[PDB]
Structures are given as structure tokens and as C-alpha cells.
């Protein structure tokens, strides 16, 4: 999965990212995912979850997406 | 209206929020909005949707969701 990608690299580089699903609201499902990066600044992604892990793929996706087009 | 909630929930407390859609891609795959707090430390929100208006009511959403989960 592309979080396997990004794992890879940050102990490479010595990086930490915060995966958690819902903000508190679990009960109602949001089906929304959010990734917090502790190394950089405090920077919060977006993922669907429209499928069994699309979320987590969503959000590693937009990450390194981002990172490309700047 | 998410935007507009937003709007009004943001000027009683003064915080305001930056946001810069990117022009690129095209509706044929879907759009992202990218939120920059300024007055607030920097932290970038990346939010998106299907068609223009889409993308601008999640990433506006997600402003809210942040707080209930930090």
C-alpha cells in the first residue's frame, strides 16, 4: 500500500506521520480519514475511505501528489 | 452552504483562513483546495471533490473537524 511507501522513508529520514480515523464521532461514521505529519509543520490530509483502506491511500497519495507538483 | 457557515463562525472568533485552489487537473478527475491558517501557526489542509464547489465545501468542512479532533 502507499502508506508501506511512505513508512519506508520516514525511518529513513527520520519522519512520523499520525494516522486516525474520525475526529470523535465514530458511532455515525464519517467514512474520513485524517493524517497528521509531526516532523514538518502541523499539516492535516484528507482520505475518503470510499473503500476497505482507500482513506489511508487517499491521504499518502495527496501527500506525495503535493510534494511533486511544488 | 458550508463556506458560509464557516464564514460566520469565523468572524465571531477572528480567525481567518487562506485558501488557494489549484487550477491544475481538470473535472475529468476531481479537483483540491489547499487551506493555510495565518493568523493560526502554519498548518496546510488538503481537502478535494468531484466538480468545482465540491472540493471547496470538504476542505472548508474539514476547518470544523480539526478542532473536535485536536
Known amino acids: 500500500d502507499y502508506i508501506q511507501l511512505?513508512?519506508?522513508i520516514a525511518k529513513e529520514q527520520g519522519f512520523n506521520i499520525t494516522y486516525l480515523?474520525?475526529?470523535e464521532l465514530s458511532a455515525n461514521g464519517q467514512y474520513q480519514?485524517?493524517?497528521?505529519?509531526s516532523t514538518?509543520?502541523?499539516?492535516?490530509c484528507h482520505?475518503?475511505?470510499?473503500?476497505?483502506?482507500?482513506?489511508?491511500?487517499?491521504a499518502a497519495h495527496n501527500?506525495?501528489?503535493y510534494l511533486k507538483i511544488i
Chains 1, 2 share one sequence.
Open 21 to 23: 480515523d474520525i475526529d
Open 33 to 37: 480519514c485524517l493524517a497528521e505529519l
Open 6 to 8: 511512505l513508512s519506508e
Open 47 to 58: 482520505g475518503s475511505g470510499i473503500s476497505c483502506g482507500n482513506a489511508q491511500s487517499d
Open 63 to 65: 501527500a506525495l501528489q
Open 40 to 44: 514538518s509543520p502541523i499539516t492535516v
